[PDB]
């Protein structure tokens, strides 16, 4: 089997991407944030505290003839941006782009933090990291990809995120028309539960390539590119007027600037992030200070190849017995 679904930016900055997901019988369609940095499929629901729902579409398990309460199971998750959610668990039928999994754990939110309430465009998350990170207790549950894998034509999914435009998540096949050149594959460590890999270096603009190992995760659920402070300082030094602002919480730059590109290494291959991809617009409405798309990871504990990097590539998440990541230009 295969599946194919369009993913759409939630706003003009590509702050996140939503993908329609069918849950239950008859289908209830929710727009979920596909997140290769976490491993829970959770949704706004009929159980979510009413004051914490503000425009989202909700899953109502009592209206699904295939929903079953997973007795005694709860979940609770906190994300790197400080947001959180928690609740109980159903199993139900879940379909993505024509690909159907029966018995998928659908984690129903009883509580969500304010940043989720405040984003009316995201109805939940669909995690695509390794199932060892799944938060369901006392019986950990499998991701949608893990449940589907055995049925897929090939044990892979691919992320093709658009810049200011829709893109595609495919399951079970590699669309050879969606990228240029060849796909370069690179080793993955699953030891932290993430799609963790080592980039071979970077360049700023037309600068020379610096060979240096950068361990990080491929994370579709993170907007920006988080890299070591040395690297980030080298990038923003090429932008007149750019500075790290403690009050804003990162590097800002004059909105009148033209940003240089940023290249990262995948083995001997190179992925080029155009400068425009690194502009996240005014820090506040009407400001001439703009927020940078490349930020320091020093306060995280891990480097994060978020959407800013991944949208410049066609990315293969290869879930073979020994997982690997593949990157192509497009």
Swiss-Prot record:
Its EC number is 3.4.23.22. Residues 17-328 form the Peptidase A1 domain. The keyword Hydrolase applies. It catalyses: Hydrolysis of proteins with specificity similar to that of pepsin A, prefers hydrophobic residues at P1 and P1', but does not cleave 14-Ala-|-Leu-15 in the B chain of insulin or Z-Glu-Tyr. Clots milk. GO terms for molecular function: aspartic-type endopeptidase activity. Disulfide bonds join 255-290. The active site is at residues 35, 199. One of its GO terms (biological process) is proteolysis. This is Endothiapepsin. The gene is EAPA. The chain holds residues 90 to 419 of 419 of the full protein.
């Amino acid at each position: 089997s295969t599946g194919s679904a369009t993913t759409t930016p939630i706003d003009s900055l590509d702050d996140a991407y939503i993908t329609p997901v069918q849950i239950g019988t008859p289908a209830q369609t929710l727009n979920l944030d596909f997140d290769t940095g976490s491993s829970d499929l959770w949704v706004f629901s009929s159980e979510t505290t009413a004051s914490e729902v503000d425009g989202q579409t909700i899953y109502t398990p009592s209206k699904s003839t295939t929903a079953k309460l997973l007795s005694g199971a709860t979940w609770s998750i906190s994300y790197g941006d400080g947001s959180s959610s928690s609740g109980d668990v159903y199993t139900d039928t879940v379909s993505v782009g024509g690909l159907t999994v029966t018995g998928q754990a659908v984690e129903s939110a009883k509580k969500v933090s304010s940043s989720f309430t405040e984003d009316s465009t995201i109805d939940g998350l669909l995690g695509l990291a390794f199932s060892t990170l799944n938060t369901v207790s006392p019986t950990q549950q499998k991701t949608f990809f893990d449940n589907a894998k055995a049925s897929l034509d090939s044990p892979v999914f691919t992320a093709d995120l658009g810049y200011h435009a829709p893109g595609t998540y495919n399951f079970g096949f590699i669309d050879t028309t969606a990228y240029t050149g060849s796909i370069t594959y690179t080793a993955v460590s699953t030891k932290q539960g993430f799609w963790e890999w080592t980039s071979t270096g970077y360049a700023v603009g037309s600068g020379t390539f610096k060979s240096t190992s950068i361990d990080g995760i491929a994370d579709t659920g993170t907007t920006l590119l988080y890299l070591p402070a040395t690297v980030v300082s080298a990038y923003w030094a090429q932008v007149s007027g750019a500075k790290s602002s403690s009050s804003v919480g990162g590097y800002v730059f004059p909105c009148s600037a033209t940003l240089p590109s940023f290249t990262f290494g995948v083995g001997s291959a190179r992925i080029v992030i155009p400068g425009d991809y690194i502009d996240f617009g005014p820090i506040s409405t009407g400001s001439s200070s703009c927020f940078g798309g490349i930020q320091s990871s020093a306060g995280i504990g891990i480097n994060i190849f978020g959407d800013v990097a991944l949208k410049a590539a066609f990315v293969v998440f290869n879930g073979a017995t020994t997982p690997t990541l593949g990157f192509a230009s497009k």
